[PDB]
Coordinates of C-alpha atoms in Angstrom, one line a residue:
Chain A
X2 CA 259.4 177.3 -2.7
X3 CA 257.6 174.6 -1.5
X4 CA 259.7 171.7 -3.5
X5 CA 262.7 172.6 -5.0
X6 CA 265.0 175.6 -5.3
X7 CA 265.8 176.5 -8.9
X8 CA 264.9 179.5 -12.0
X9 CA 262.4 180.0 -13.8
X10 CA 263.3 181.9 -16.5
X11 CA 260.6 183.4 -18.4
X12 CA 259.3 182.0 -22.4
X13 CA 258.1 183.5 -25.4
X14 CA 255.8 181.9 -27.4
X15 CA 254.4 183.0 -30.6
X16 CA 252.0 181.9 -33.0
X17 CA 250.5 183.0 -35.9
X18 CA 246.8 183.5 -35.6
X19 CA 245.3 185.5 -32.8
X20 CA 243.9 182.5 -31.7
X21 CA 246.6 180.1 -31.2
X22 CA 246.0 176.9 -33.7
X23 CA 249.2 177.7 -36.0
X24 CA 252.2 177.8 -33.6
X25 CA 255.5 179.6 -34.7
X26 CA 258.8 178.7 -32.7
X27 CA 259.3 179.5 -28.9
X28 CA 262.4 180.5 -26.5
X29 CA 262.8 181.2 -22.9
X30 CA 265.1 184.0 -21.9
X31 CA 268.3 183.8 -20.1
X32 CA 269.0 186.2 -17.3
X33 CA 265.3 187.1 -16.2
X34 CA 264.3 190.7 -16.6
X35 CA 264.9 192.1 -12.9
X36 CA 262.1 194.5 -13.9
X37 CA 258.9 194.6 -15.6
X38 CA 256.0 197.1 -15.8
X39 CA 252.2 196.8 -16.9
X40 CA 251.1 200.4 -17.7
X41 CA 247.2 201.3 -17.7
X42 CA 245.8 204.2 -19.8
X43 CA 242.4 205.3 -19.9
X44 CA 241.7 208.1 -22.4
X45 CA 238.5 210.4 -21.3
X46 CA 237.3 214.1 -22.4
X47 CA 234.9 216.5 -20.7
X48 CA 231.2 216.4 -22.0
X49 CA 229.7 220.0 -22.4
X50 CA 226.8 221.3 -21.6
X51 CA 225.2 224.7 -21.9
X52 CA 221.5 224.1 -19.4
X53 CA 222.8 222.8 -17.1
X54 CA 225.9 222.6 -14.5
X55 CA 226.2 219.3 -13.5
X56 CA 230.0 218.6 -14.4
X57 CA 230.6 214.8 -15.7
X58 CA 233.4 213.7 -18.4
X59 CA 232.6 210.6 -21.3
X60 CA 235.0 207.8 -21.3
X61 CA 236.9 207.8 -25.1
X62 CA 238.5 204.7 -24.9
X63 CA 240.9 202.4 -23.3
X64 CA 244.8 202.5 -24.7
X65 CA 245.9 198.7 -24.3
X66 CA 248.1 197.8 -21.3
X67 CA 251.4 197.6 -22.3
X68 CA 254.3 195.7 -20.9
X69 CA 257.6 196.8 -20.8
X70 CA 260.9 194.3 -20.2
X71 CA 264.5 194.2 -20.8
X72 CA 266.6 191.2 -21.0
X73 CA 270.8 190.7 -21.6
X74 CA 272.6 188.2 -23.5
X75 CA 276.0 187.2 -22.9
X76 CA 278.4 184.3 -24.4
X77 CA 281.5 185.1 -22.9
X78 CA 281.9 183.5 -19.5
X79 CA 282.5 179.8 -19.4
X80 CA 278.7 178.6 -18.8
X81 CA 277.6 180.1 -21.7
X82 CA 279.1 178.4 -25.1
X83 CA 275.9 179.2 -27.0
X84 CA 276.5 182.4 -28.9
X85 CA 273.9 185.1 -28.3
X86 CA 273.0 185.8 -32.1
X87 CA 271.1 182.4 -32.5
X88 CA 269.3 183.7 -29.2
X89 CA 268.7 187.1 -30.6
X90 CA 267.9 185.5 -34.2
X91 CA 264.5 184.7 -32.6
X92 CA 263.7 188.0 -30.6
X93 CA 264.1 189.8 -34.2
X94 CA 262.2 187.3 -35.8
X95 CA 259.1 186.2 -33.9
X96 CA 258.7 190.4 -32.8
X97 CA 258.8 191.4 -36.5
X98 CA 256.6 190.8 -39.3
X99 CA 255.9 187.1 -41.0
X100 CA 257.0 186.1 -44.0
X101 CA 253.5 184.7 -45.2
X102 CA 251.3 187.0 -43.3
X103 CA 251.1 190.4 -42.8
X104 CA 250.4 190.2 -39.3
X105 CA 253.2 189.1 -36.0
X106 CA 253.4 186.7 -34.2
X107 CA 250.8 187.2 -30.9
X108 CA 254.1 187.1 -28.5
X109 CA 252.4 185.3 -25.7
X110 CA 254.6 185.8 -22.2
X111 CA 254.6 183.6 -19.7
X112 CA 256.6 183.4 -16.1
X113 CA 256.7 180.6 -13.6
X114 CA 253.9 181.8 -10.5
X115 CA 253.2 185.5 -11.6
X116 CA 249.8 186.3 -12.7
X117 CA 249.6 189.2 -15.9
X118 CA 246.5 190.9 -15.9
X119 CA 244.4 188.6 -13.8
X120 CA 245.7 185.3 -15.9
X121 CA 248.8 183.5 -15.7
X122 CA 249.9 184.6 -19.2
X123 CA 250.3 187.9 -21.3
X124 CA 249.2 188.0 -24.9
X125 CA 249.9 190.6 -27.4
X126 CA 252.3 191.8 -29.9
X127 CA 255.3 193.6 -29.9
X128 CA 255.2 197.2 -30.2
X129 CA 258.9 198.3 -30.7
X130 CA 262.4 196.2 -29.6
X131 CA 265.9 197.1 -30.0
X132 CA 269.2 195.0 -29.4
X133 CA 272.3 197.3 -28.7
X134 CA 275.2 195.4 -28.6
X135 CA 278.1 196.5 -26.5
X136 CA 280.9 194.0 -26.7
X137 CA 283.0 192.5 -29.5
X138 CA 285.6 190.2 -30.5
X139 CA 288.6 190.1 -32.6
X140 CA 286.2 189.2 -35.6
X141 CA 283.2 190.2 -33.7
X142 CA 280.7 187.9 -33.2
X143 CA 278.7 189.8 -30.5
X144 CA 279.1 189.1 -27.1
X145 CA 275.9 191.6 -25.2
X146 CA 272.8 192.3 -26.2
X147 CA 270.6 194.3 -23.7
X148 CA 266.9 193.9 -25.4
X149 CA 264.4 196.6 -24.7
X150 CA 261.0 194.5 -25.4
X151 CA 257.3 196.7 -25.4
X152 CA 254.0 194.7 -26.2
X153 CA 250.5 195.1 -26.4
X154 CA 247.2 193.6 -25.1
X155 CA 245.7 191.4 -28.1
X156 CA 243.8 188.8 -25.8
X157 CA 242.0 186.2 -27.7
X158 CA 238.4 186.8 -29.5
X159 CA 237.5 183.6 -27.2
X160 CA 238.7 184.3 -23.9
X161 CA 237.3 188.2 -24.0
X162 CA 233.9 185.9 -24.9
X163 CA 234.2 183.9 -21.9
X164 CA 234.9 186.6 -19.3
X165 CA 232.1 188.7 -20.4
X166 CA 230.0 185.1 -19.4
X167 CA 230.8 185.3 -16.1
X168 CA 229.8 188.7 -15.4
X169 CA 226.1 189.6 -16.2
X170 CA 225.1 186.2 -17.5
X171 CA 221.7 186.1 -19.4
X172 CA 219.6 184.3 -16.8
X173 CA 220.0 186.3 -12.9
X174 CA 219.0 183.4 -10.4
X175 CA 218.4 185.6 -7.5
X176 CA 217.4 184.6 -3.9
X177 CA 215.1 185.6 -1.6
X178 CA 215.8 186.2 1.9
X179 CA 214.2 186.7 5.3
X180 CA 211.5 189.8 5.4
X181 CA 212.5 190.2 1.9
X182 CA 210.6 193.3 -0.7
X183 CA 210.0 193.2 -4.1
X184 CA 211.5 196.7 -4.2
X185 CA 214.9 195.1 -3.1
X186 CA 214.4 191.4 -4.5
X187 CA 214.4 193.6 -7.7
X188 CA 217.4 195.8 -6.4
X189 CA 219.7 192.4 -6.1
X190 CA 218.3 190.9 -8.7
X191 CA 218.9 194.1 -10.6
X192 CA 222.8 194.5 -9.9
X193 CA 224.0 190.8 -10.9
X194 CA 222.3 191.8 -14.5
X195 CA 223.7 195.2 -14.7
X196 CA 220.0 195.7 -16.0
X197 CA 217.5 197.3 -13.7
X198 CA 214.8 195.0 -14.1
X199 CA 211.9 195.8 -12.6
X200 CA 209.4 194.7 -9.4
X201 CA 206.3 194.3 -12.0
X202 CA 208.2 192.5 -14.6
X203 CA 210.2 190.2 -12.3
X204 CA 206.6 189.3 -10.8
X205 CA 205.3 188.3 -14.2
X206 CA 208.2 186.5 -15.1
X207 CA 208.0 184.1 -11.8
X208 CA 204.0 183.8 -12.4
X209 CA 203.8 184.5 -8.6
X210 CA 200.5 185.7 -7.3
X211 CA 200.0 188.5 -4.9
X212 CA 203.3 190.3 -5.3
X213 CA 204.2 188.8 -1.9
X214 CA 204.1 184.8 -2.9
X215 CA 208.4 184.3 -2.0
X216 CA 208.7 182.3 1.1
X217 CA 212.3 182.8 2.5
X218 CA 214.2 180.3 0.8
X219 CA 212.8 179.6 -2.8
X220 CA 214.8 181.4 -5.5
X221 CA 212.8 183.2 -8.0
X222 CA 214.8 184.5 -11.7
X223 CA 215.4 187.6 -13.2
X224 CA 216.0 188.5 -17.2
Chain B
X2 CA 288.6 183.2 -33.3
X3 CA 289.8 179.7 -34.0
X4 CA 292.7 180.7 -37.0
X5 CA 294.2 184.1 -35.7
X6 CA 293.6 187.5 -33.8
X7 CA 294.0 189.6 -36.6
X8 CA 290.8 192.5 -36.4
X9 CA 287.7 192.5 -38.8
X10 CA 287.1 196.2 -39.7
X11 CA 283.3 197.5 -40.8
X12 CA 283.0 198.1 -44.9
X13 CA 280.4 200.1 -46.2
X14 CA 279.5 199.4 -49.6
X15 CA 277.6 201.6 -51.9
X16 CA 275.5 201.0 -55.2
X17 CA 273.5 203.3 -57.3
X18 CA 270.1 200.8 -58.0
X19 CA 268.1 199.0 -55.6
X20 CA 270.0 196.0 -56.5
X21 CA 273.5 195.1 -56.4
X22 CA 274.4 195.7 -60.4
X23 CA 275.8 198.9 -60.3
X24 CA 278.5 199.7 -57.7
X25 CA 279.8 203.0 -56.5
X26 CA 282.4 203.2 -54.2
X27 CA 283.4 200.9 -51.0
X28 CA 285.6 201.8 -48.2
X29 CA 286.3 200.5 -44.8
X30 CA 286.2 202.7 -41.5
X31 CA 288.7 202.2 -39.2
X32 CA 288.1 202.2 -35.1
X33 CA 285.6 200.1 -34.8
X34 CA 281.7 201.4 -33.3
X35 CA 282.4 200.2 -29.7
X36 CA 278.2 199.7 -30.0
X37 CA 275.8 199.1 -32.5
X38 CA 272.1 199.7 -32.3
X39 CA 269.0 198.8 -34.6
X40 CA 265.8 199.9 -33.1
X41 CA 262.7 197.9 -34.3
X42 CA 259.0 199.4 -34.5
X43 CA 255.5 198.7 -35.3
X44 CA 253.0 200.7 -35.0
X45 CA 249.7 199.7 -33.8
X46 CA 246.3 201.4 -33.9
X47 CA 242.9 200.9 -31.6
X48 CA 239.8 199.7 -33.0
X49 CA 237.4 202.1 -31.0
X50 CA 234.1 199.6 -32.1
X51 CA 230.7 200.3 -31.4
X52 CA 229.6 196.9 -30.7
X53 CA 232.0 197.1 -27.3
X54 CA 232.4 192.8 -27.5
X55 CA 236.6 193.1 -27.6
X56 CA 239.2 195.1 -26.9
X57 CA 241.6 194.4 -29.9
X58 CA 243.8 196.5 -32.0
X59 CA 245.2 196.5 -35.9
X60 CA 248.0 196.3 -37.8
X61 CA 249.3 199.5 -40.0
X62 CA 252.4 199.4 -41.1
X63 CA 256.0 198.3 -39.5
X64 CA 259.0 201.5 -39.6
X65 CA 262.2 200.6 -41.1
X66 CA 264.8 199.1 -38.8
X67 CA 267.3 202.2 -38.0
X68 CA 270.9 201.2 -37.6
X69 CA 272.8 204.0 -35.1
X70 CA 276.7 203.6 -35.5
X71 CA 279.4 206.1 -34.2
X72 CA 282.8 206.1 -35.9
X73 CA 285.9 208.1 -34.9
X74 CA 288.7 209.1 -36.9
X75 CA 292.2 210.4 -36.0
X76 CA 295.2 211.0 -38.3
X77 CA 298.6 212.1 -35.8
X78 CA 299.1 209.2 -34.1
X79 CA 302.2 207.3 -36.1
X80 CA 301.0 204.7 -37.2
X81 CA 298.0 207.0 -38.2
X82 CA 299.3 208.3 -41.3
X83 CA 296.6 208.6 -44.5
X84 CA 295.0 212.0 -43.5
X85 CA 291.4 211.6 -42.6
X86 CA 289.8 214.0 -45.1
X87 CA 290.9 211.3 -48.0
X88 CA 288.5 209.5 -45.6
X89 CA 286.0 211.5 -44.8
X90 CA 285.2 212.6 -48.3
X91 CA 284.1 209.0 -48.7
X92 CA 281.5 209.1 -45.9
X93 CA 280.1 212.5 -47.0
X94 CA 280.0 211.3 -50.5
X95 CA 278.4 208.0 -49.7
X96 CA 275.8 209.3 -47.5
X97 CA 274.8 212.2 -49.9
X98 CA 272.3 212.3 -53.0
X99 CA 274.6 211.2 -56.5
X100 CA 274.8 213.9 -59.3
X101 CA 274.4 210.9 -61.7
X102 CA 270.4 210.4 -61.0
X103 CA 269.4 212.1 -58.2
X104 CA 269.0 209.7 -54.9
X105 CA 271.1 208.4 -52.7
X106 CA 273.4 205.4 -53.0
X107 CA 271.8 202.7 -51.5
X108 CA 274.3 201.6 -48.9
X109 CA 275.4 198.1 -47.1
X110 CA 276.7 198.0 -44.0
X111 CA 278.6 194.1 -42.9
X112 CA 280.8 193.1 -40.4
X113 CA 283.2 189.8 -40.8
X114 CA 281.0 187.5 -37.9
X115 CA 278.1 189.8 -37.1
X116 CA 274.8 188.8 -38.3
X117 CA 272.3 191.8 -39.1
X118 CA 268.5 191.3 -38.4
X119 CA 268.3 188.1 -39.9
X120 CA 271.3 188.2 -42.4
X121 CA 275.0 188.9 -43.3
X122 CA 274.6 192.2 -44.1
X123 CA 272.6 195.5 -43.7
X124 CA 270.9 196.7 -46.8
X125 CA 269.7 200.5 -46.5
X126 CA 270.3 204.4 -47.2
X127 CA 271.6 207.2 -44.7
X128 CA 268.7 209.1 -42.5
X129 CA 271.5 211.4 -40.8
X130 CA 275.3 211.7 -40.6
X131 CA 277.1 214.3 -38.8
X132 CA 280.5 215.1 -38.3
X133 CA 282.4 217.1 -36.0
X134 CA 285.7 218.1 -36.3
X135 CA 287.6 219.0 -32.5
X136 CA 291.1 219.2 -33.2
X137 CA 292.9 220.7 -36.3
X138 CA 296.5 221.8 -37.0
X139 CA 298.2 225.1 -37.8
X140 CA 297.3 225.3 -41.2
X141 CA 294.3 223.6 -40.0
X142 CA 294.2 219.8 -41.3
X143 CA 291.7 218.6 -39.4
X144 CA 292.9 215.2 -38.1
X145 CA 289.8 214.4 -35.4
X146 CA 286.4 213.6 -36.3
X147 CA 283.6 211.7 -34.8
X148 CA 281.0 210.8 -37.2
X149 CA 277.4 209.7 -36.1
X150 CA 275.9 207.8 -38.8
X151 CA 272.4 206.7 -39.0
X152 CA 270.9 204.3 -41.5
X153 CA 267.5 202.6 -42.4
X154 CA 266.0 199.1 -43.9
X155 CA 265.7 199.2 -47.0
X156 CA 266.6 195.8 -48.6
X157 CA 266.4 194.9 -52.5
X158 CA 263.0 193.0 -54.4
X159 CA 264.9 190.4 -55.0
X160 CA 266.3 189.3 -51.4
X161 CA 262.8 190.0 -50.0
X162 CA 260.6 188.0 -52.7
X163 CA 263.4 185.0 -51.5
X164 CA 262.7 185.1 -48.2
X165 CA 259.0 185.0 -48.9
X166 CA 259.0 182.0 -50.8
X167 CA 260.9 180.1 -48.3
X168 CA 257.6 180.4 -45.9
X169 CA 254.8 178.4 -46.8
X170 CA 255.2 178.4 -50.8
X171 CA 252.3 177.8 -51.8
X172 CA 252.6 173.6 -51.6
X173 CA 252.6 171.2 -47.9
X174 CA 253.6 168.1 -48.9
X175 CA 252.4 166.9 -45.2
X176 CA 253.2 163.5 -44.1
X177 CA 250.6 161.3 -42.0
X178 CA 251.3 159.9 -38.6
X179 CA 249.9 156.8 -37.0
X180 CA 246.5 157.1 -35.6
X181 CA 245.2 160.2 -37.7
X182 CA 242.5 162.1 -39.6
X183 CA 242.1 164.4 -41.8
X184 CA 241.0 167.2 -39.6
X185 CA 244.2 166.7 -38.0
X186 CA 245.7 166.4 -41.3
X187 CA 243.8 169.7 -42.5
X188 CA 245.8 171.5 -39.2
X189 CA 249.2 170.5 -39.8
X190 CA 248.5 171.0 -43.4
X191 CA 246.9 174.8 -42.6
X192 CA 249.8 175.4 -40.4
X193 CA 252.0 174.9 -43.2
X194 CA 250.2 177.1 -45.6
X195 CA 248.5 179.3 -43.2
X196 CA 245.3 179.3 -45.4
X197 CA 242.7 177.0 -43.8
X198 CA 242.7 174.4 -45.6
X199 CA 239.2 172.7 -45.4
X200 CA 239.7 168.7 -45.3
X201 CA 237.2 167.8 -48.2
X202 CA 239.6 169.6 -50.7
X203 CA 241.9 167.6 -49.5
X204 CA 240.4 164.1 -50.1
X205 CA 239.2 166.0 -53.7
X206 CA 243.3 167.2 -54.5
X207 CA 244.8 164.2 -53.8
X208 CA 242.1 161.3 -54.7
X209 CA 241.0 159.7 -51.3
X210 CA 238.8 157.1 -51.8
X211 CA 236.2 157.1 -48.7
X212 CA 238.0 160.4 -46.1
X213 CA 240.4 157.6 -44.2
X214 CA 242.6 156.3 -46.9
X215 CA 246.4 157.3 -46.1
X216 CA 248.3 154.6 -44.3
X217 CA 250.8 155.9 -41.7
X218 CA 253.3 157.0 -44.0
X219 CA 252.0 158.1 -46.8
X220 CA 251.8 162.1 -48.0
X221 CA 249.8 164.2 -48.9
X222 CA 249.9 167.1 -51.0
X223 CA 248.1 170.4 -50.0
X224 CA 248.2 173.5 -52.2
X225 CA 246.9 176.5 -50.8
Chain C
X59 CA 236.1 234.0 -20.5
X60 CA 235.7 230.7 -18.7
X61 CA 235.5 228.2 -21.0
X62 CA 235.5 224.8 -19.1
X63 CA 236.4 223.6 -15.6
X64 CA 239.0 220.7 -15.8
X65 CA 237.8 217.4 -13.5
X66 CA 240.1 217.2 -10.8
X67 CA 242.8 214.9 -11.0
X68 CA 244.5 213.3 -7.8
X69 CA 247.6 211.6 -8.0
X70 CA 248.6 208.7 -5.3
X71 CA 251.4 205.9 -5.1
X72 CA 250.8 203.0 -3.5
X73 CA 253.8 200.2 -2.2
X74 CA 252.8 196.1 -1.6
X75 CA 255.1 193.8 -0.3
X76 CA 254.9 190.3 1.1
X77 CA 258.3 188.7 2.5
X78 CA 259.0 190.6 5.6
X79 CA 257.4 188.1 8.0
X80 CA 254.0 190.1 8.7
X81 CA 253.5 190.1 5.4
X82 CA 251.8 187.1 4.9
X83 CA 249.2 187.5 1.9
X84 CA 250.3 187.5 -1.7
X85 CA 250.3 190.6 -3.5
X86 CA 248.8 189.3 -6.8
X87 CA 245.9 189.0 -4.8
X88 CA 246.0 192.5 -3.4
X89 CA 247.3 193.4 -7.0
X90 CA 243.9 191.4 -8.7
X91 CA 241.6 194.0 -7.4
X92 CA 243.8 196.9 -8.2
X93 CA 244.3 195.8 -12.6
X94 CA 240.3 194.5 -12.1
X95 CA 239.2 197.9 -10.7
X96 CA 241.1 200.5 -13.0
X97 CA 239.9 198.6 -16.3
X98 CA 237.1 198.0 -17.8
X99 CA 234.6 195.9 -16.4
X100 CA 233.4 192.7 -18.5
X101 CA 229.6 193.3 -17.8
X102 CA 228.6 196.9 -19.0
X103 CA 232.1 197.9 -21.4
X104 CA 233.0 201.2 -18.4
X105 CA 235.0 202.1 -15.7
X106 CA 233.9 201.4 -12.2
X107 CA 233.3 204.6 -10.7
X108 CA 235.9 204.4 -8.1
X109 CA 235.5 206.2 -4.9
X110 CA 239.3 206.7 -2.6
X111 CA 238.5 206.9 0.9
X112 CA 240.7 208.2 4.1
X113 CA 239.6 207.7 7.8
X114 CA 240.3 211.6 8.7
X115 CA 241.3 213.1 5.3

């Protein structure tokens, strides 16, 4: 909407560093997927105690988020005169392993307007894939495919740096507002830091005299 | 297309080594699949780290891709006339350890226009076969039989060392373009080789005389 | 014996849509907070301690 009316069929990118320098091939898939699914796992276990009764459980780890899609081919009816083997010689060979390098190929997924996981792309790797084809010719070249894609997470080391900047940076920055406390210019200052700093050590940090020397509108910093 | 409609059948062909030096027997099935399927998979495991910086996981180790096939056989039909035991004990022989050294025989599956994962053929050895005989005769010839076969990857030393050395072996020979440098010559260069390949060996290897000495045409040679 | 007390789980399913013409806001906006809450948050490396609410439930 908004200019024009027209698909936007999905692309596969790959390269082969986690990072993105070294770029393998690309293609963008014909009949878009009509579904996909993001699926969230959190593993946890109950922590035991034998004092008390207080009943809490310790988070294990977190299972990536995985992203399940199908796709067909097709190169029967008269708009399609590409066959669907050179289209499926790059879903076999950009979601197996390199020829060089041990590792895959980082499988980055992208669609027009539809944000991932809070970004406009997914990275990761293929888990599993599987082509099934169901119709043949005389001599049979194929003629379906029906692709059962699964991937994985596997952001960049950079880009997990850079989101873990903008929440708790080093310095806090906090404010001070009207009939303000050390006790709660602390508390505030406390939750932007994830840190619990405290009243006495913010007030030595600042230099401030009396442990009342904010005037409603100066910003004093945190650590 | 394009000559005739005549059919392709699938031929299995067996061996006894990994290679292709020794053959064993070869037939061709009759009534074509109606589907294939090879299911890829890699498997992928977590780093639980301490440090808590990224969320990342490792490589192990990628499963063989599994071809699943389902052939039928029928021998009352009049044009059907080769009883389908004569073809059968093929299969079952084929897909079964060999008395001569103990293993099985190392089979290839091909179609005639098909192309396998990224080749002509299927290399590979039987997981699973099963047949199931539904209708028989009076003296009981069996004449039905729906077989399931099921194969893995499995490809030769030789095919798979090829392949290698047609990725990145082991020399660039990158050309310059106008208005470069060498760290931009180093990237195309380390995307060839995949090995990082740090700009002042570069102007070492192939004699540069002060780090912007190629003219716009020139190549450069980049081993590992 | 009792050995252990497993946490109580609750299970809930949830429907966004935005064409019918109420529905004005996007739901990868409604969907942002959703994938940001139920992951692991970039400042501490936890969960966020969620907390479901219902006006008479």
């Amino acid at each position: 909407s908004l200019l024009e009316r027209g698909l936007s069929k999905l692309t596969l990118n790959a390269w082969k560093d986690r990072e993105g320098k070294i770029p393998a091939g690309s293609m963008s898939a014909m009949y878009n997927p009509e579904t996909i699914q993001l699926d969230y796992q959190t593993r946890f276990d109950t922590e035991d105690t034998i004092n008390t009764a207080s009943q809490s459980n310790r988070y294990v780890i977190s299972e990536p988020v995985g992203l399940n899609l199908t796709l067909l081919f097709d190169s029967q009816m008269p708009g399609n005169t590409t066959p669907i083997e050179t289209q499926l010689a790059m879903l076999k060979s950009l979601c197996a392993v390199d020829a060089a390098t041990g590792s895959p190929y980082f499988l980055r997924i992208t669609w027009g307007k539809m944000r991932w996981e809070n970004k406009g792309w997914f990275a990761g790797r293929a888990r599993d894939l599987s082509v099934t084809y169901t119709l043949f010719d005389r001599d049979a070249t194929p003629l379906r495919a029906t692709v059962q894609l699964s991937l994985v997470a596997d952001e960049s080391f950079v880009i997990q740096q850079s989101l873990k900047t903008q929440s708790a940076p080093d310095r806090a920055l906090v404010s001070v507002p009207d009939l303000a406390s050390l006790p709660l210019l602390a508390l505030s200052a406390g939750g932007v830091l994830a840190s619990s700093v405290d009243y006495l050590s913010l007030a030595w940090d600042n230099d401030l005299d009396n442990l009342d020397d904010f005037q409603t509108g100066d910003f004093l910093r945190a650590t």
